[PDB]
């Protein structure tokens, strides 16, 4: 059963309680669907001196098939270190990625290979499968989302939250299932994931429209072309994300299949969790 969870305290293990007045608003790292992301530096504490960057929303929730704040922590998913609430609001204190996100380090390089892409989506799968191991469904997933640290290793902006931004979704990258509404699954998750490794390797979008609508349509019914320049085993992998109906979308029987395609032959996944795989790119 779906359980949602609604986030109004969270301290990170040792620390205490924080509030809006033990920060300090420096600048606006960016600003997402839900509202500005912030850089704040903490004035107080072990890590008075810390940069940490801050999401500002109305409310939010996890919903959970089926602590949770602490079990999502992963190599390659940005940490909470604080949620608190005042004044109708509440406040989102996590790490801050000083790479960049990862499309905008790819455009700074003249070209790259599969295999640069491949590291990327290989910590991708990693972390999405750590969310979907939990019963957690990241629904929203896009490139804006997918960040690199200070090496360039992978790190997700969020982890599976329902959100409402507080001064009173992205068709590009929804399986067809959620624009015909059935619900975000995993095997959704996994269809995004195609769309990710389809423009990432093409530097195209595989359906796009004049509007949203005619986006949809695109994703529901247009017939789209397989990039011949691409390897047997990225073509192959990305037909079976590609799959319209999901639980015939790979993915959608655990992570495991997608771990032993042969498009990851060559990625040691031991190596990759503990990080000792090196990034493409230094940012
Ligand atoms: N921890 C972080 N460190 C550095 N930059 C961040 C961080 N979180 C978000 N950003 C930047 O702020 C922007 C918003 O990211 P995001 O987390 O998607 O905001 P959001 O609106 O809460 N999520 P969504 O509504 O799904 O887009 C992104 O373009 C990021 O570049």
Redesign the pocket.
């Given at each position: 059963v779906v359980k949602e969870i609604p986030i109004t305290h969270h301290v990170k293990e040792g620390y205490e309680k924080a509030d809006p007045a033990q920060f300090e608003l420096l600048k606006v790292?960016?600003?997402?669907?839900?509202?500005?992301?912030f850089?704040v530096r903490k004035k107080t504490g072990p890590d008075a001196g810390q940069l940490?960057?801050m999401?500002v929303?109305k409310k939010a929730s996890l919903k959970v098939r089926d602590d949770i704040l602490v079990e999502v922590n992963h190599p390659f998913i940005?940490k909470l270190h604080y949620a608190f609430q005042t004044e109708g609001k509440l406040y989102l204190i996590?790490?801050?990625?000083?790479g960049?996100?990862v499309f905008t380090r790819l455009s700074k390089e003249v070209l790259f290979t599969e295999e640069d892409v491949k590291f990327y989506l290989a910590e991708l799968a990693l972390a999405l499968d750590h969310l979907h191991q939990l019963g957690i469904v990241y629904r929203?997933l896009?490139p804006?989302?997918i960040?690199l640290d200070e090496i360039g290793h992978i790190?997700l902006?969020?982890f599976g939250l329902s959100?409402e931004?507080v001064d009173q979704?992205?068709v590009e990258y929804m399986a067809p299932e959620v624009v015909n509404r059935r619900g975000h699954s995993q095997s959704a998750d996994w269809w995004s994931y195609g769309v990710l490794m389809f423009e990432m390797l093409t530097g195209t979008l595989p359906f796009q429209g004049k509007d949203r609508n005619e986006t949809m349509n695109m994703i529901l019914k247009a017939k789209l072309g397989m990039p011949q320049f691409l390897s047997a085993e990225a073509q192959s992998l990305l037909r079976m994300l590609f799959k319209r109906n999901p639980a015939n979308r790979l993915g959608s029987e655990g992570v495991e299949e997608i771990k032993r395609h042969l498009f990851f032959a060559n990625i040691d996944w031991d190596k990759l969790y503990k990080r000792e795989v090196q990034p493409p790119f230094k940012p």
């Open positions: 790292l960016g600003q997402g669907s839900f509202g500005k992301v850089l940490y960057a999401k929303l940005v996590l790490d801050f990625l000083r960049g996100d929203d896009k804006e989302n960040l790190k902006t969020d959100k931004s979704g992205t």
